[PDB]
Amino acid sequence: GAMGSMERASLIQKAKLAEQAERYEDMAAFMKGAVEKGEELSCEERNLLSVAYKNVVGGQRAAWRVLSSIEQKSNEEGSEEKGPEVREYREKVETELQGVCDTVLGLLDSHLIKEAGDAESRVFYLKMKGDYYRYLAEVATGDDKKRIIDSARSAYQEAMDISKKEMPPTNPIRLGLALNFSVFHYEIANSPEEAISLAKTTFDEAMADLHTLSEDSYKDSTLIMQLLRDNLTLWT
């Protein structure tokens, strides 16, 4: 890999610079290089990996949705035939998005998850696995769509099981996992009632645990609780 000659610490340092410069493709490449050094990632390093790829795939997802909308309009009654270009370009962006998801999933499988023993690392990576299968499910339309959805579900479920056994209900990783799994249920799995129930129960169990927290931990947890509430307001 092109980062094979760069020191691990230099890759980390440059990932932080790339974030400051809003160079998220660079940030992701630096973090991929750091993962490929083979050592486990610290909490901060896991977060840099996630931020980098979240920004990259976020731009691709936004572009894909714009193009998909144009493509759908072109296939409406009365719409002038414009040739293959919209489909081709949507397919181009889709393939690139799938490539990024495959890259992230590949890092998780080789070998971040299998070396992650602590709940905070293991839940974090399993949540990420669910998230990137979810992004693949957003664009899937073929014979593997059901399997992609099931892969997302399975990763989220394993993360949930660990999080409930090993983390307090206010833990921000646990909360963000629940939030994202609820979005999976609503947007991917056609299960809005499961989505609502999960968000509700998560919010309520966190509320009851806030009294145990410092001021700074309280801020961290309540921020994510508000996202759960925002979704519940949209969905109900």
Partner: peptide, 9 residues
């Protein structure tokens, strides 16, 4: 609905 934004360290 929104997932975790997750775009800032």
């Amino acid at each position: 609905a929104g997932s975790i934004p997750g775009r800032r360290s």
